């Protein structure tokens, strides 16, 4: 159905299709489906009048989509307001790991190009 | 380098070892260090005879 998340995609198995409604990744997909007895060997184009009911029911029990996507980034911004290493480095486009900034960190700073040394 | 000094099995089963001993699991290190230390003082304090070579058997 419409559900708590966004509109259902079709032509894909239930486990599959659930990952494409975000705030739900690999595990969380099949985990919900398992619990409510929903089969994940059937598609959402093969969705039934049973499975559709528990669909909306179960997704309302967890923090997912926009709501989740808010909360998470509020804590990225929490640390930024603390003046933290982990904080400030995220507005310099820099990792917080043991990851090199010498050659690597071109996910952080995007594709390499000749620019000031 | 220019000479790489091939002697690593000329003193193997072609001529005898110059320090034949055995050591067990946690003795390896100990037996190694102790032997070599003695030889330094030994060779130094003897010079009134013409040393062919020290050897030890443990």
């Amino acid at each position: 159905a419409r559900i708590a998340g966004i509109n259902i995609p079709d032509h894909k198995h239930a486990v599959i299709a659930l990952t494409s409604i975000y705030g739900v990744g690999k595990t969380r997909s099949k985990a919900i489906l398992a619990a409510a007895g929903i089969a994940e060997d059937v598609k959402i184009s093969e969705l039934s009048e049973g499975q559709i009911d528990t669909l909306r029911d179960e997704v309302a029990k967890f923090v997912v989509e926009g709501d989740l996507r808010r909360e998470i980034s509020m804590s990225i911004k929490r640390l930024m307001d603390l003046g933290c290493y982990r904080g400030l480095r995220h507005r310099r486009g820099l990792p917080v790991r043991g990851q090199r900034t010498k050659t690597n960190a071109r996910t952080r700073k995007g594709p390499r190009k000749p620019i000031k040394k | 380098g220019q000479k790489v000094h091939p002697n690593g099995i000329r003193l193997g089963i072609v001529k005898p070892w110059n320090s034949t001993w055995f050591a067990n699991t946690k003795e390896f290190a100990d037996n190694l260090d102790s032997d070599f230390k003695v030889r330094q003082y030994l060779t130094k304090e003897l010079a009134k005879a013409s040393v062919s070579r020290i050897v030890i058997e443990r």
């Binding site: - | 089963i13 070892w17 034949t20 001993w21 055995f22 067990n24 058997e57 443990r58």
Partner: protein, 103 residues
């Protein structure tokens, strides 16, 4: 299988030392015990290093080592009153491990 009751662990690095040792003592082992067990060779416990041959740089050439540590057994079976002989009194160390026990 068949099990032995006396086991002696003769252990040295070189086969040109371990088998000099074996031949001097498995001789005496004949008259020792009520049945002979000859010397089981066992698979070698082996070590082997690779250490850099140069004081500085390089990785093209490193010194290649081996060092097989052979483990012979002398062995007897059936304890007798003359087991004392070939065990400790006729087998002594010299840079070759000698087990003074029945294991």
């Amino acid at each position: 299988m068949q099990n032995q009751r006396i086991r002696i662990r003769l252990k040295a690095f070189d086969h040109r030392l371990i088998d000099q040792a074996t031949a001097e003592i498995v001789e005496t082992a004949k008259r020792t015990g009520a049945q002979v067990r000859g010397p089981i060779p066992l698979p070698t416990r082996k070590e082997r290093f690779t250490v850099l041959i140069s004081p500085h740089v390089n990785k093209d050439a490193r010194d290649q080592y081996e060092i097989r540590t052979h483990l012979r057994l002398v062995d007897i079976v059936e304890p007798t009153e003359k087991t004392v002989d070939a065990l400790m009194r006729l087998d002594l160390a010299a840079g070759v491990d000698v087990q003074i026990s029945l294991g």
